[PDB]
Amino acid sequence: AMGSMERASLIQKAKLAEQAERYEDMAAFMKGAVEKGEELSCEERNLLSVAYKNVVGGQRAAWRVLSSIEQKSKGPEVREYREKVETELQGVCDTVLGLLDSHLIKEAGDAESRVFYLKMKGDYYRYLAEVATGDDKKRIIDSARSAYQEAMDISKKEMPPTNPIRLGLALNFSVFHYEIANSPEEAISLAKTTFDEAMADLHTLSEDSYKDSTLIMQLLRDNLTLWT
């Protein structure tokens, strides 16, 4: 589908689709790029993540709007449409999890690349958990837990506590604890530790690195106030 297009040309068109806010096009161009079978640069990684985050973004927001309507009660139309949107979102999460496990997740590389992709794996299993039920839910929750746990163990060993990728991982694992695993104690406990351990080392940073770390510390602090 993107098979006949040059890798450089897919990257260029992913950038045009982002400028045109055509996130579905951007996601399909970046998928064809990944399928060329070469590693992604830090910039390319971010374009892939942006594209699929905006696609799955729109579907999770729609799904939320329909779920709340469904909950306030009754013909089957609200459930049927909620289910179609659910089904599309699962289609997109399955595509991301497939690209991650077929092409992006490797034992090679720096800590930055390996944590980035295991965090993403946690995020997309977390999006599936948001809509799952029954025995399927239990398996999905374990998948999200193991992706995040594997990512946490790397980031604790190979990265300082201020590293924005470590901090965004810790923020998303805390969201998982609060929203999916129904453990608000572990959510608050991780967010609080992540924040305090970062603040201890803030003085080692300068310029954009200081700003990038405090950006994510603010979101940990936002969740901590909302949750306590």
Binding site: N46, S49, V50, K53, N54, K119, D123, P164, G168, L169, L171, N172, V175, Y178, E179, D208, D212, L215, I216, L219, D222, N223, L226, W227
Partner: peptide
Amino acid sequence: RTISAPVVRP
């Protein structure tokens, strides 16, 4: 509601 890691623009 609850906030998760944003997209990074730089």
